[PDB]
From a paper:
During transcription of pre-rRNA, the formation of a large knob can be observed by electron microscopy at the 5′ pre-18S portion of the nascent pre-rRNAs. This particle, known as the 90S pre-ribosome or the small subunit (SSU) processome, is responsible for early processing of the 18S rRNA at sites A0, A1 and A2. UTPB is a large complex composed of six proteins Utp1/Pwp2, Utp6, Utp12/Dip2, Utp13, Utp18 and Utp21. Utp21 occupies a central position in the UTPB complex as it interacts with all of the other proteins except Utp13.
The crystal contains one molecule of Utp21, but no Utp18 molecule, in the asymmetric unit. Residues 1–19, 327–337, 393–408 and 660–663 of Utp21 were not modeled due to missing electron density. The tandem WD domains of Utp21 fold into two 7-blade β-propellers, resembling an open clamshell. Blades 1–7 form the N-terminal WD1 domain, and blades 8–14 form the C-terminal WD2 domain. The two β-propellers of Utp21 are more open with an angle of ∼150° compared to those in Aip1 that have an angle of ∼110°. In addition to the core β-propeller domains, Utp21 possesses an extra loop (residues 657–684) following the last strand, 14C. The loop wraps around the side of blades 13 and 14 and inserts into the inter-domain space, making contacts with blade 1. We have found several highly conserved patches on the bottom face of each of the Utp21 WD domains that are potential binding sites for other molecules. In summary, structural mapping of the crosslinking data places the WD domains of Utp1 and Utp18 on two opposite sides of the Utp21 tandem WD domains.
Residue numbers in the entry: 20 to 326, 338 to 392, 409 to 659, 664 to 684
């Protein structure tokens, strides 16, 4: 519908809080996470991205299970059966209820719904790849038990499904339909269940921090371990020889307990954010001393036990909150630098492996409010500058070692840093203060080189031409400053009619654009120091903007929930897109091929293909109402 941009894919998505599944991969295992309406499959021993489901489900995936080489994904009243990210079959349950839980075992598929029904599907022939024929519908009436919490199959329990509810534990024979067992009432609410590696035993977690070892055959407790003032969210048994139990909690802690020594081994504190559900799943890999953990904070971590407290091994993740600032890190379209209000700085790969890595800050730094990066001096010295909220100094980072750098750059006028910039050569860093000063630092030695004082209000933008001749600045005072870099002379001043909130400088054309509080975009020629164009159209605050690499276009985003393309030779809007999720950032790839956008909701970065590498006709309400790119692509 848009004439310029077509949705490509989304970067930086790992997990959303749905408990991940584990399956078999030849000799190794695979991990299935949820991203929303898409699942992703990783190798368990490398965390390499193996698959992503090729086609989005109509609604959000609620449950994931893996059985051999098949993934079962529940959404609405449906269960999708996938192999290699490709849907091989779709089960539509005869109900308007939603599927909540899944259990696949023997010739059976069991899917419980939110009205306490359990739909049972069966293989026609045992050598079928998956169950497909509806067999029966069980129901747990409120007298038989409480709300269904989990469906489990215990080892050697032929044709027998264990249905754990909030108040009790039931045993159904799914072949005959008979309820063969129902335990005594449990006093405290059951929240979690997990088959033990020995006969007849299932582990049950409660709302109170109790893990109960329950014997299904005799129908009695065998053991009850108390975890003080914790709410259990996951259980898993180690199975490599050591009789250990892991207990995840909603507060984000992972507790390791020795079943034989009856003592608390250890506790990994706050490995996942509590506000996102804490530990939503934690699983020991079968036969291995490795535990895989996840939460709703978009991370997937792996912990090992060396032949001793567990040691961090590897992990994959992205931001837990929407990205606040982004930038292309290089001209080969390899990495993107991305900052979020979760106080993290990440580098995301744009390539197929979807690799990513958080910038080491070696309790986090305050949230980033401005960002600049240049690839010129990578490996040689610091090449990233960040401004942080309410801090009077900018920090530096090293893109080579993915770690914070040596220098901090003070404003010198007791103001906060409100803008940062870098020379193309990578030799200089620029810092703009809330008190008006502009400071120029040496990226190699960290030394203060030069100081300018023109603005009397916050400097909201700074840049320097590719030849380091003329430096330009903007501020909330509505002033545009022009300075000689080699000396320190004020080359000129412009007074604009509204406060200026941001600047983007186009080095190959020496034009720079400014976002003003009057909702216009002002384009200025740095050589002539004159306004050459003014763009009017947006009906709300401008969030971001960028030049197309050639210099012909400017693309802008706004609170009005639009993304507009402006042709500079005419100053007219030649394309407009209406999104349902306001764009907070827009950046062109160094080469004109891609457009990166960040939005109010969503942890990732949207990639768009510029399919116009066009008419000059004006538009109005002919804007396209486009959706964001699919998480199922690539």
């Amino acid at each position: 519908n848009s004439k310029i941009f077509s949705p490509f894919r989304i970067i930086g998505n790992v997990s959303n809080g749905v408990p991940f599944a584990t399956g078999t991969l030849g000799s190794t295992f695979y991990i299935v996470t949820c991203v929303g309406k898409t699942f992703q499959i990783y190798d368990a021993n490398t965390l390499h991205l193996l698959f992503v489901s090729e086609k989005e489900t109509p609604s959000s995936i609620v449950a994931l299970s893996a059985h051999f080489h098949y993934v079962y994904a529940a959404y609405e009243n449906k269960v999708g059966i996938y192999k290699r990210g490709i849907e091989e079959h779709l089960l539509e349950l005869e109900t308007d209820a939603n599927v909540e839980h899944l259990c696949i075992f023997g010739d059976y598929l069991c899917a419980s719904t939110d009205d306490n029904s359990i739909f049972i599907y069966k293989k026609s022939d045992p050598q079928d790849k998956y169950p497909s024929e509806f067999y029966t519908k069980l129901t747990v009436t409120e007298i038989q038990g409480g709300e269904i919490v989990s469906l489990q199959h215990l080892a050697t329990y032929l044709n027998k499904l264990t249905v754990v509810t909030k108040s009790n534990v039931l045993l159904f024979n799914v072949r005959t339909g008979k309820l063969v067992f129902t335990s005594n009432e449990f006093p405290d609410q059951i929240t979690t269940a997990e088959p033990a590696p020995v006969l007849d035993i299932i582990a049950l977690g409660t709302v109170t921090g109790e893990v109960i070892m329950f014997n299904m055959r005799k129908g009695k407790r065998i053991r009850t371990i108390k975890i003080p003032q914790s709410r259990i969210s996951s259980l898993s048994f180690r199975t490599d020889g050591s009789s250990h139990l892991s207990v995840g909690t909603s507060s984000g802690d992972l507790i390791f307990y020795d079943l034989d020594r009856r003592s608390r081994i250890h506790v990994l504190k706050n490995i996942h954010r509590e506000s996102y559900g804490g530990v939503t799943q934690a699983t020991f890999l079968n036969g291995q001393p490795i535990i895989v953990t996840s939460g709703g904070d978009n991370s997937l971590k792996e912990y090992v036990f060396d032949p001793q407290p567990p040691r961090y091994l590897r992990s994959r993740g992205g931001h837990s909150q929407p990205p606040s600032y982004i930038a292309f890190a290089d001209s080969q379209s390899h990495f993107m630098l991305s900052a979020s209000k979760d106080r993290s700085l990440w580098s995301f790969s744009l390539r197929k492996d979807a690799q990513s890595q958080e910038m080491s800050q070696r309790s986090k730094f305050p949230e980033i409010v401005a960002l600049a990066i240049e690839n010129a001096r990578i490996g040689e010295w610091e090449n990233i500058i960040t401004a942080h909220k309410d801090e009077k100094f900018a920090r530096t980072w090293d893109m080579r070692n993915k770690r914070v750098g040596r220098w901090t750059f003070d404003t010198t006028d007791d103001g906060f840093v409100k803008s940062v910039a870098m020379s193309q050569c990578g030799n200089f860093g620029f810092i703009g203060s809330s008190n008006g000063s502009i400071t120029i630092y040496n990226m190699q030695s960290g030394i203060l080189r030069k100081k300018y004082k023109l603005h009397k209000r916050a400097v909201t933008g700074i840049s320097l031409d590719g030849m380091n001749r003329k430096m330009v600045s903007c501020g909330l005072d509505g002033i545009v400053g022009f300075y000689d870099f080699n000396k320190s002379t004020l080359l000129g001043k412009l007074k604009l009619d509204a406060p200026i909130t941001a600047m983007v400088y186009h080095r190959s054309s020496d034009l720079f654009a400014l976002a003003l509080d009057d909702l216009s975009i002002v384009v200025i020629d740095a050589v002539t120091q004159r306004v050459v164009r003014q763009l009017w159209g947006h009906s709300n605050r401008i969030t971001a903007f960028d030049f197309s690499p050639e210099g012909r276009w400017i693309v802008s985003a706004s609170l009005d929930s639009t993304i507009r393309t402006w042709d500079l030779p005419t100053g007219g809007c030649i394309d407009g897109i209406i999104v349902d999720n306001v764009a907070t950032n827009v950046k062109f790839s160094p080469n004109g091929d891609l457009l990166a956008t960040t939005h109010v909701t969503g942890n990732g970065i949207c990639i768009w293909t510029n399919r116009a590498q066009s008419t000059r006709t004006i538009d109005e309400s002919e804007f396209a109402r486009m959706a964001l790119p699919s998480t199922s692509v690539r």
